[PDB]
Amino acid sequence: VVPTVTMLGVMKSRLVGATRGHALLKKKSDALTVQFRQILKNIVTTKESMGEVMKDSSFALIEAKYVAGENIKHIVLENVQNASIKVRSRQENIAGVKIPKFEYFTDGETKNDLTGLARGGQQVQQCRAAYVKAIELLVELASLQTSFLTLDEAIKTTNRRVNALENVVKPRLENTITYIKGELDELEREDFFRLKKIQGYKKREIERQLASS
Amino acid sequence: TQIPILTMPNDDITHPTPDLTGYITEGQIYIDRQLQNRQIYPPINVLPSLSRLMKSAIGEGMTRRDHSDVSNQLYANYAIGKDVQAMKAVVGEEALSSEDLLYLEFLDKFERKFVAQGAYDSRNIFQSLDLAWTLLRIFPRELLHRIPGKTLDQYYSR
């Protein structure tokens, strides 16, 4: 840490860059937190729909038992008129972070139906609706987890910057300024004054010798 | 009227002579190195610049009435445009709202037209204010918060 003005300028530039980076990181973290809050609200709505989804689904099973009695069981297993299990998900970059758009059955591609059973309509209205809810549930859960991890990392980086980087650089700048001034300027002026005194009393001695001679 | 052209050593204001003349004088217009790098012939750093007696210079009889208001609005919008450019850098610009795009394009058009003036091109203060107004029309009427009422609709009509 040479007290030379080059190091002082370098440290000042580093502090300015640190401040700008801190501001940018704070803005990015705030935006990511807002997006995560919106995703959390959506996930809360989907969770509220959950449970009632299963309550609606149980009616389809009751209707199947009332109409067709026991299901086909084994590989067939009956009870399904729609919502073939086929999905389509893709990671999408939102707020600079890739978020998988987990679109599951009843909202995913290649979903298929085979007419309707005795309670196949009830199954479609109950079981397939649960799949549609679960598609959004999975997408929102993945997005929320990714956003939470990213926001935690960004907040950690910003807090680390504000607590260590500037809080160390500013003392470095202060120490550089103090050393530079109070050493170089003070000692240079002292040397110059001592030289001036040397010349002064040399002239005094010359005058004294001239008076003597 | 005195307009000294004082070179700041080491490209900073902390040098003895720049700080001293700043203490003595009552204004500081700047010249941004980056604008020269970006090749804007007038590199005057408008956002850093400032004149202490700006209010006295601008008036109805001398200059036009809207001058001070448009100066303040342009300064605030320039700042917002710089902030929006930083935001578009950090978040990828997809998350930007419509107003963000408005501020960013205003910043771009400002740097393209208002800041860059021909070395021999001459603009009267009325002409310069008209140019600033033309830059301003791209914002919606409500968006110009700093502009006083009944003065906006007076000129924003175009």
Q: Which residues of chain A lie closer than 8 angstroms to B12, CB-CB?
A: 9
CA-CA distances (angstroms) from residue B131 to A138, B71, B156? 53, 12, 12
What does the block give as tokens for A141?
A: 């859960």
Beta strand pairing call for A88-94 and A97-103: antiparallel
Beta strand pairing call for A97-103 and B50-51: unpaired
Q: Which residues of chain A lie closer than 8 angstroms to B90, CB-CB?
A: 24-25, 27-28, 31, 96
Q: For B91, which of A5, A9, A28 is closest by C-beta distance? A: A28
**CB atoms < 10 A from the CB of B58, how many?**
18
CB contact under 8 A, B90 and A35: no
Q: Which residues of chain B lie closer than 8 angstroms to A23, CB-CB?
A: 86
Dihedral sign for Cα atoms in the order A28, A29, A35, A38: negative
- What is the rounded CA–CA span in Å between residue A131 and residue A212? 118
Give residue ranges of A with CB < 8 Å to any B CB.
5, 9, 23-25, 27-28, 31, 35, 93-96
Q: Which residues of chain A lie closer than 8 angstroms to B86, CB-CB?
A: 23-24, 27
Three-class DSSP labels, chain A = CCCCHHHHHHHHHHHHHHHHHHHHHHHHHHHHHHHHHHHHHHHHHHHHHHHHHHHHHHHHHHHHHHHCCCCCCCCCCCCCCCCCCCCEEEEEEECCEEEEEEECCCCCCCCCCCCCCCCHHHHHHHHHHHHHHHHHHHHHHHHHHHHHHHHHHHHHHHHHHHHHHHHHHHHHHHHHHHHHHHHHHHHHHHHHHHHHHHHHHHHHHHHHHHHHC
Cross-strand pairs, A88: A103
| Residue B60 amino acid letter | E
Q: What is the resolution of this structure in A?
A: 4.3
**If we measure between CA atoms, which residue out of B18, B36, B37 comes closest to residue B28?**
B18
Q: For A28, which of B10, B12, B90 is closest by C-beta distance? A: B90
